[model samples]
Target: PLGSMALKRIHKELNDLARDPPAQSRAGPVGDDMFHWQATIMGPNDSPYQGGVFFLTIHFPTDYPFKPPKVAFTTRIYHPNINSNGSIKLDILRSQWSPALTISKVLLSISSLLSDPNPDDPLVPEIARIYKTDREKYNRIAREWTQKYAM
Candidate 1:
């Protein structure tokens, strides 16, 4: 069950998002235990993913604030931090999570990750391989997925 502390945090995040909202991101009610969040980031102008919109999902846990929530993509995205199923591979959202981290920070970090990929801990080995071998092709696929789904 979610305590007052957790609910307070959730409410604050929800309110903040409602007021300011993330760029290309929106939050909506899902079920009793979850809030569905969607985001579409414009690819960094200089990067291969530039001029593209990438979609992602964020699932808040029942004990949010005390427990980090899960983030996934409903749209196909090519990146080291995201698996084929759209799951994120971030440490802070997992074992390294701390109560001090906020949802705003997490979402921002994810947006930043689009421009900078961490190949050392890749979720998609094939994408990582292509990123290492042929950068152009990798970018092309990322752009294609963005247009097909996020756009």
Candidate 2:
């Protein structure tokens, strides 16, 4: 059973997102399960991830709004802040989380992240190192992987 407060907010969000979806991203519930959602994000144009389509899963905890939703990529992506297992290293999803943050906003933030990664707080150190020192190689490999897997 859905928490009444969380369910209301989730319904509102669904309607709002349907009315005004964010650029390069779309999200919706997985069947009748309001707690689980699937999202798709087109790679940001200014990033090496460009031309790729990325899929992510969002799982809202029972005590949601107060507790941040768990979100992770299902599609393979090459980014310093995103691990091979698809876990993302982002502040808003962790210690910096706030109840006011909505899935639409989060997806937009993630879209921006693809264009501008935070190497200082990386989930993949090797990728971070390459991004900092060998930018061309990093960009090449990211694009290559996008073509190989994300296309």
Candidate 3:
């Protein structure tokens, strides 16, 4: 068994997540794969995603916090920032990442994104347009998808 600074950090982070679980989400190593994690973000209240549990796949990089992990929805979700194909567009996982950010913080942000979509920098333009112009319609479809896939 060997370890790098990244591996140590990842182990500690996962341990911390278990020690003090976040209210909105939970994550851990997927089976025996430490670099691969399975995370679930509970749908936030007051959002169309409510009553749903969305699963995400997180593959930590060799450099970890030095470079952001690759995150994608393993479960389908209907949101402006989330593509129908289960990919998410989030900035913290991109150019705005900082080493100080933990998995706990990232999961919380994902939950917040559920309730508050960034339609401005949208991954799905049609969904963004619907979220902007016909929010009721957007909510309806999102709720239906949640029921169909996340229930």
lDDT by candidate, in order shown: 0.73, 0.91, 0.88
lDDT per residue for candidate 3 within 21-129, as digits (tens), equals 7877888885877888998889999999998988999898888769998889989998989886777788999999998989898888888899899999999999999
> So what's the TM-score on candidate 3?
0.94
- Give lDDT tens digits, candidate 2, residues 85-112: 8999988999999999999989988988
Candidate 1 vs. truth: CA RMSD? 2.5
lDDT (Cα, 0-100) at 13 in candidate 3: 96
Please give, for residues 38-151, the per-residue lDDT of candidate 1 as tens digits: 555566666666767766677777677778978777777778678878888888888999888877777677767887887888888878888888888888888777677666
User: TM-score winner among the candidates?
Assistant: 2
Clashing pairs in 2: none
Q: Which structure is stronger by lDDT: 1 or 2?
A: 2
Candidate ordering by TM-score (highest first): 2, 3, 1
TM-score of each: 0.82, 0.96, 0.94
- Alpha-carbon RMSD of each model: 2.5, 1.2, 1.7
List candidate 2 stretches off by more than 4 Å: none
Worst 10 residues of 1 by lDDT: 33-42
